Structure 1
Amino acid sequence: IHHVTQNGGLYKRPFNEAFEETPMLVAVLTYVGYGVLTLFGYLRDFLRYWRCHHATEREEQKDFVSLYQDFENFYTRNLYMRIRDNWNRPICSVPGARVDIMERQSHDYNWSFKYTGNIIKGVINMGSYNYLGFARNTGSCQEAAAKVLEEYGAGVCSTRQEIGNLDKHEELEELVARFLGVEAAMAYGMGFATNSMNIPALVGKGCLILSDELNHASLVLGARLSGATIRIFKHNNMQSLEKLLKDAIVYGQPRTRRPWKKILILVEGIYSMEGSIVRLPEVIALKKKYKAYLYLDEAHSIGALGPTGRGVVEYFGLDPEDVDVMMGTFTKSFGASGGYIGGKKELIDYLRTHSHSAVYATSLSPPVVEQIITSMKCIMGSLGKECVQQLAENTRYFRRRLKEMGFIIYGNEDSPVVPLMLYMPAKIGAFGREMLKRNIGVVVVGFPATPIIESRARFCLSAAHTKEILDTALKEIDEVGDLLQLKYSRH
């Protein structure tokens, strides 16, 4: 037992996350970098009062009310369009550890691109969701789907409550329920489409939703589609969580003061940006104190946390029977496509009836079901459950390694996602080109998907990354962080 601090949140292990506040001198220089950039945008759009070539709205028989706001497209053409060479690069291989990248360039200053012919090979990637290393066209794991592909085909032309319902679908929905250790489970077509089609089938008009500051575009969208009051609490702030949670019961609606119909909470396991784990036992202890429900999102967390990785519940060692509904995907540890919902059998049956997607959308393709099954078989017991001990070794090694190198890292230390802090917007545009010169492709995260002084880069660790693959990348970063002086930390 480690911490039982105030809310009854019982901790087994030390927690050890790190949110180092940004330095004073660093932050001021950022606004200057945007300030010069917002200056030329008004300059550039003023120059466009006569005629880098544009999409040119049809003149032929048109010119109604214009389609777009000119001003809402400001940042996409004056900060994005300048440096959009990165995070869009086509690859032409299996996204494993080394990735063949088609080379492209623009003499029109990123306004129109061009492939030369080039295939930049053996590029170490750190920007793919390939945690347990199942992206390979080799081995017996993917080979089993080839038997399924030559037999079944590549997609039902039907719906789940309609004709299309294969035995594999019935098999997989069983298989995850034993994997999660819950009663029943149900797979969906893609992980985005799960939250945007099932959360509106749960909450209704008189409900209240307590979601985090930074969930996803999934979880917000499902909360918009269900007409329901949405309230935001601060990120991993149980005190700010309980403060809303207190006032949610001792008040009701704003207009009437009737009680709420039901309330629930939308939280994720591992937040993708600023890779951090939610203070989960302080949430389980608090929802029992206030009779709220809980929607949990193991999109990143499953296959990455716990021994023989089974999401954050085994990582906190807790029970699956206190989380009211569990959701995760198959794209981000399994090398597949789609997502599930785990929950009680009463819940699943209600969602086998009121689904928005089992009744309208077509279901999974048959061979990618097999890729999910054989991957879970290698986990449940052949590149199997030894790689999660490898990745946690790779996580814990790489996390201390950049921290002692003077870089600044967010999130919990055991989190495989490595948020690396840039601050200047030019340092965004240089860094993606700079690492690509040093035979490594990474993911940089721009301004509007962050706050202003975050503008970070992000690393996805992998169990497929060995030590020599990892240390070679450590050598390349040591030069670049020197070259751009991005050694912001004091320690």
Structure 2
Amino acid sequence: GLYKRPFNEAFEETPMLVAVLTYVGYGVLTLFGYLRDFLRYWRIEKCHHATEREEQKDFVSLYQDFENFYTRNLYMRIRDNWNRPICSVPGARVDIMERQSHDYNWSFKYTGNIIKGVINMGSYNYLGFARNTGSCQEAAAKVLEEYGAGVCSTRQEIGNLDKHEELEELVARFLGVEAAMAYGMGFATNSMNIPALVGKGCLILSDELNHASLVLGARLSGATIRIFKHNNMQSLEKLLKDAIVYGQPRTRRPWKKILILVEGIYSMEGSIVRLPEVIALKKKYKAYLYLDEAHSIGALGPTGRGVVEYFGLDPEDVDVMMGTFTKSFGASGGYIGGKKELIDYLRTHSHSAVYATSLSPPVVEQIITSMKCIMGQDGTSLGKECVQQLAENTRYFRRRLKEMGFIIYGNEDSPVVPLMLYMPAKIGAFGREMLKRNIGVVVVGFPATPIIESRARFCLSAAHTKEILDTALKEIDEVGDLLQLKYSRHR
């Protein structure tokens, strides 16, 4: 495969001193955690956690205490960063209900006052459709008045409505594939439609950084799972060759199927998948492709049709196209697109259709209205404006952040920008300092990531203006000066 335009990604390596220092910090935390646990065990220090009721003392202990080691010792110290309640629409500016704790984050008590105007860089807005006023809200209100809050049965029995059918045909037209099917949860889409496609005696080649839903769907099916390196086409060639040549592990038999699970944009890294190469190998080795366009269905592409439009390839090359409405379109749900026989088989033999409740009518109405707005069916130019504004914002933000001396991951086109903090204490420090300057960011630590790579993710949007980006960039530069977060040798 070849690229019609350059494909440039930068993953700068960690400085050695920073690695030594983060190991020092983790060792200190581990030793103090062991001392903490000893003190709590010998009842010298009071334990604030709940306890099993006295009637079940002789029962086997519910949890293994070593499993929650990091929860009590490392997670609880900076627990105030994550579960931050909000009390307004998650636009470019969000209102956060401010909270305080006096028992060192074990229990939080809410103060009356409320923060206002916090710049939102943690919500998944990509086209700015999360608005409490507009045309989509009016249509959703109309359908809510007509239809109600939710359906009370499954698709197969009585829960199929006309709204679902028209949403499915609209999605099929939008993607470009023959047919599509819709579900009420993006997680459930994978977890219930991967077991149906593959079973015992098949092979699944998962990326190194796949989402939890894809992994759970792979495990629920009896297929064998092999993990190849992140965006390493050579590794994918090697696993495909070995799987085809050597067959099944115990008794040498041909694989019934070979399925490759990949995503458009990986949220944490921000790296766009090398789609032309993987499609080339898929065709060469006669494999099947499952593409998760959860993050790229609205963010990427000149018109917002996904990575298949960003690269310019043919949607018929991708066998299964999963997708999620939560990120870009501003409403919950999910979908799978493909050929008509695939959609019929999924309509008949999918867990979600048989046993699970359908989508809500206002939600499908909001999805329909937003999708019509993107494709220009309303007749206005609002569809193209947001798509070009998002690209302008992401290019400006990434360029200015990289020229300041920070370390940034991923491709230059991906709207998600991971800055690297590299140290356990700088996670909480960055979170608290950024909140003190009225900016909301998301910090990811050790057990999720590798040990040396701890990050903070900025999710950009088309709702952000130039003034908001300038304010955020100035605050980021000031904080990076304060915490010495500029680790880049190149600039």
TM-score, normalised relative to structure 1: 0.97
Q: Look up the SS of the partner of 2:225 in the other structure.
A: strand
Q: Look up the SS of the partner of 1:374 in the other structure.
A: helix
Structure 1 CA distance for aligned equivalents of residues 424 and 76 of structure 2: 13
**Does residue 382 of structure 2 align to residue 383 of structure 1?**
yes
Q: Look up the SS of the partner of 2:67 in the other structure.
A: coil
CA positional deviation for 1:50:
3.5
Count of matched residue pairs: 482
Q: Look up the SS of the partner of 2:210 in the other structure.
A: coil
Structure 1 stretch displaced more, 352-361 or 53-62: 53-62
Structure 2 CA distance for aligned equivalents of residues 473 and 208 of structure 1: 46
CA positional deviation for 1:60:
2.9
Q: Look up the SS of the partner of 2:80 in the other structure.
A: coil
CA positional deviation for 1:140:
1.4
CA positional deviation for 1:253:
1.3
User: Deviation string for 1:108-162 (max 9, x for gaps)?
Assistant: 0000001001210000010110001011101112211100011100110000001
Structure 1 CA distance for aligned equivalents of residues 210 and 24 of structure 2: 30
Alignment of 1:296-445 (within 5 A): 296-380=291-375, 383-445=382-444
> Which residue is 2:154 aligned to?
159
Structure 1 CA distance for aligned equivalents of residues 249 and 58 of structure 2: 44
TM-score, normalised relative to structure 2: 0.97
Equivalent pair of 1:159/1:358 in contact (CA under 8 Å): yes
CA positional deviation for 1:341:
0.2
Structure 1 stretch displaced more, 51-60 or 429-438: 51-60
Structure 2 CA distance for aligned equivalents of residues 118 and 89 of structure 1: 14
> Which residue is 1:39 aligned to?
31
Structure 2 CA distance for aligned equivalents of residues 208 and 137 of structure 1: 46
Equivalent pair of 1:293/1:324 in contact (CA under 8 Å): yes
Structure 1 CA distance for aligned equivalents of residues 21 and 230 of structure 2: 26
Q: Look up the SS of the partner of 2:326 in the other structure.
A: coil
CA positional deviation for 1:10:
1.3
Structure 1 stretch displaced more, 139-148 or 330-339: 139-148
**Does residue 144 of structure 2 align to residue 149 of structure 1?**
yes
CA positional deviation for 1:284:
0.7
CA positional deviation for 1:443:
0.4
Tell me which of 225, 232, 235 is aligned to 2:227. Answer: 232
Structure 1 CA distance for aligned equivalents of residues 75 and 226 of structure 2: 31
CA positional deviation for 1:194:
0.3
User: Deviation string for 1:207-243 (max 9, x for gaps)?
Assistant: 0000100111000000000011000000000001101
Structure 2 CA distance for aligned equivalents of residues 233 and 119 of structure 1: 47
User: Deviation string for 1:17-48 (max 9, x for gaps)?
Assistant: 10111111111111111000011111011011
Structure 2 CA distance for aligned equivalents of residues 295 and 65 of structure 1: 43
Tell me which of 138, 161, 168 is aligned to 2:163. Answer: 168
> Which residue is 2:129 aligned to?
134
CA RMSD of aligned residues (A): 0.9
CA positional deviation for 1:59:
1.6
CA positional deviation for 1:195:
0.2
Structure 1 stretch displaced more, 19-28 or 51-60: 51-60
> Which residue is 1:19 aligned to?
11
Structure 1 CA distance for aligned equivalents of residues 312 and 146 of structure 2: 41
Structure 2 CA distance for aligned equivalents of residues 231 and 369 of structure 1: 36
CA positional deviation for 1:329:
0.2
Equivalent pair of 1:203/1:228 in contact (CA under 8 Å): yes
Structure 2 CA distance for aligned equivalents of residues 189 and 345 of structure 1: 21
CA positional deviation for 1:490:
1.0
Structure 1 CA distance for aligned equivalents of residues 471 and 41 of structure 2: 51
CA positional deviation for 1:254:
1.1
> Which residue is 1:6 aligned to?
none
Equivalent pair of 1:130/1:333 in contact (CA under 8 Å): yes
Q: Look up the SS of the partner of 1:178 in the other structure.
A: helix
Equivalent pair of 1:284/1:322 in contact (CA under 8 Å): yes
Equivalent pair of 1:98/1:125 in contact (CA under 8 Å): yes
**Structure 2 alignment gaps of length 5 or more:** 376-380
CA positional deviation for 1:385:
2.2
Structure 1 CA distance for aligned equivalents of residues 2 and 41 of structure 2: 64
Structure 2 CA distance for aligned equivalents of residues 61 and 323 of structure 1: 54
> Which residue is 2:266 aligned to?
271
Equivalent pair of 1:131/1:333 in contact (CA under 8 Å): yes
Structure 1 stretch displaced more, 203-212 or 133-142: 133-142
Equivalent pair of 1:378/1:385 in contact (CA under 8 Å): no
Structure 2 CA distance for aligned equivalents of residues 61 and 318 of structure 1: 61
Structure 2 CA distance for aligned equivalents of residues 195 and 393 of structure 1: 32
Q: Look up the SS of the partner of 1:209 in the other structure.
A: strand
CA positional deviation for 1:62:
3.8
User: Deviation string for 1:157-188 (max 9, x for gaps)?
Assistant: 00000100110000000000000000000000
Structure 2 CA distance for aligned equivalents of residues 99 and 61 of structure 1: 45
Q: Look up the SS of the partner of 1:359 in the other structure.
A: helix
User: Deviation string for 1:87-110 (max 9, x for gaps)?
Assistant: 110000000000000000110000
Equivalent pair of 1:100/1:120 in contact (CA under 8 Å): yes
Distance 1:254 1:128, change over 3 A: same
Structure 2 CA distance for aligned equivalents of residues 245 and 154 of structure 1: 47
Structure 1 CA distance for aligned equivalents of residues 129 and 112 of structure 2: 29
Structure 1 CA distance for aligned equivalents of residues 109 and 304 of structure 2: 42
> Which residue is 2:22 aligned to?
30
Structure 2 CA distance for aligned equivalents of residues 118 and 197 of structure 1: 43
Q: Look up the SS of the partner of 1:264 in the other structure.
A: strand
Distance 1:490 1:62, change over 3 A: same
**Structure 1 alignment gaps of length 5 or more:** 1-8
CA positional deviation for 1:61:
4.0
